[PDB]
Amino acid sequence: NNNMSLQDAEWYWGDISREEVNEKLRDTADGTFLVRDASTKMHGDYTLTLRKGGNNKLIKIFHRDGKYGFSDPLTFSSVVELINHYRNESLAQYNPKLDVKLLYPVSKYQQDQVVKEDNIEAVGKKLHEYNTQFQEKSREYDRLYEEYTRTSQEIQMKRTAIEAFNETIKIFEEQCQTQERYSKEYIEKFKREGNEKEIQRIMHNYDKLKSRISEIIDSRRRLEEDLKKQAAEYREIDKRMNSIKPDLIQLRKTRDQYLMWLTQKGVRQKKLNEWL
């Protein structure tokens, strides 16, 4: 009626390592739980993992003299009845600082009615085509990563060049400004004597300096727009990666479900080795 066999239990998951249980309780609501065989592999241990307060609480079930329970008094006939007892009353009884009522079990039957083509050939055929999508899609992401990282280095290299240009410009322009400062007292005396060469030659250096100053600023000016194009192309690569990533998770998650599913229904993975 309620206390059916532990095998025919939605929450009981058998022998799944702790790592698998973590991926199945990750970012789930407070009160999620599932049961599995203790990690030691000894018979009749049945660790209970509960998700309370962001953390994965891990309460152990003791089995002595054909009885089960958390604390010393194992006043319970079987795991199913113990779970159902605490599935209706909060665990504050066992632990005063533990207030959750085993609300959302992680049922293994829910995963069952999401798959299709239960036969042995369609699974391999459908699974084979996902792998083609997975490898081609996965490699697609990896190639973009190379552009994203290679693009990042070029942007940083250009940015440092801009700083160097700024320093160079300030050095050049400051000298020009220093030109007049020093060319204030000698200029009057030079003007008095009608020496065309001194006026022209002084302007000759000054004229050359203006070309250098102007030429340098042009170099920085052009390089900046080159960076902006790189910066723009950089963001675009970021957009593609973000819109590709969830596809990889979705494809890989469904892809592995079938690969794991093939083993469950009495199929040896040697044949799946060549199916790919």
Partner 1 sequence: SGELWGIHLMPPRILVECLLPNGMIVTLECLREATLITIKHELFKEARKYPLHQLLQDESSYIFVSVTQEAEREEFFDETRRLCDLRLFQPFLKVIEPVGNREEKILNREIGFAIGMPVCEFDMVKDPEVQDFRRNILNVCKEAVDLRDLNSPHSRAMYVYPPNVESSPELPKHIYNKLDKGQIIVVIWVIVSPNNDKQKYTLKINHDCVPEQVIAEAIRKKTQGKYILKVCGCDEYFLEKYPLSQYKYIRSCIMLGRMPNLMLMAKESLYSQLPMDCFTMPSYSRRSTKSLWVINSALRIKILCATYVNVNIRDIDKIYVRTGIYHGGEPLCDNVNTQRVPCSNPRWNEWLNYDIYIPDLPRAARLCLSICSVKGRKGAKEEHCPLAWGNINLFDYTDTLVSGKMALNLWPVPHGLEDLLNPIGVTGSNPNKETPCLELEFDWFSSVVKFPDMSVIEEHANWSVLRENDKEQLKAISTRDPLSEITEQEKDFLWSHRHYCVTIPEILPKLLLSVKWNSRDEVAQMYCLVKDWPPIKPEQAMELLDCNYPDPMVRGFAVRCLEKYLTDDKLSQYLIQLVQVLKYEQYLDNLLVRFLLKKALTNQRIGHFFFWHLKSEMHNKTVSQRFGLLLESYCRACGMYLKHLNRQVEAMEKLINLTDILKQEKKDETQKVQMKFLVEQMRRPDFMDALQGFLSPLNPAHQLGNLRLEECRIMSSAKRPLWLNWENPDIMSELLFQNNEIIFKNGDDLRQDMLTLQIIRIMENIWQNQGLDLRMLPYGCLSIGDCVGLIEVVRNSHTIMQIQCKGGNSHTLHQWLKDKNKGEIYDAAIDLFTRSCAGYCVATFILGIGDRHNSNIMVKDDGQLFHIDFGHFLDHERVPFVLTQDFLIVISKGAQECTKTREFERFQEMCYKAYLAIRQHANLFINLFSMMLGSGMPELQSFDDIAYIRKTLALDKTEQEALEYFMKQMNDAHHGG
Nearer to partner 1, 65 or 185 (CB): 185
Could you list the residues that contact partner 1 (CB under 8 A)?
A: 17-19, 22, 26-27, 30, 39-41, 47, 53-55, 57-60, 70-71, 95, 98, 145, 160-161, 163-164, 166-168, 171-172, 175-176, 178-183, 186, 198, 201-202, 205-206, 208-209, 212, 216, 231, 235, 238-239, 242-243, 245-246, 249-250
* Residue 272 Cβ vs partner 1, minimum distance, rounded to whole Å: 15
Nearer to partner 1, 3 or 269 (CB): 269
List the Cα angle 80/85/86 in 5-degree steps. Answer: 105
* Residue 166 Cβ vs partner 1, minimum distance, rounded to whole Å: 8
Nearer to partner 1, 84 or 219 (CB): 219
Q: Name the burial class of residue 208, with classes exposed (0-12), middle (13-18) and buried (19+) by CB atoms within 10 angstroms of its CB.
A: exposed
Nearer to partner 1, 237 or 267 (CB): 237
Nearer to partner 1, 36 or 123 (CB): 36
* Residue 17 Cβ vs partner 1, minimum distance, rounded to whole Å: 7
* Residue 179 Cβ vs partner 1, minimum distance, rounded to whole Å: 3
* Residue 76 Cβ vs partner 1, minimum distance, rounded to whole Å: 16
Residue closest to 223 by CA, chosen among 164, 267, 140: 164
Gap between the terminal Cα atoms of the chain: 44
* Residue 1 Cβ vs partner 1, minimum distance, rounded to whole Å: 30
Nearer to partner 1, 4 or 204 (CB): 204
Q: Which two tokens stand for residue 227?
A: 């960076």
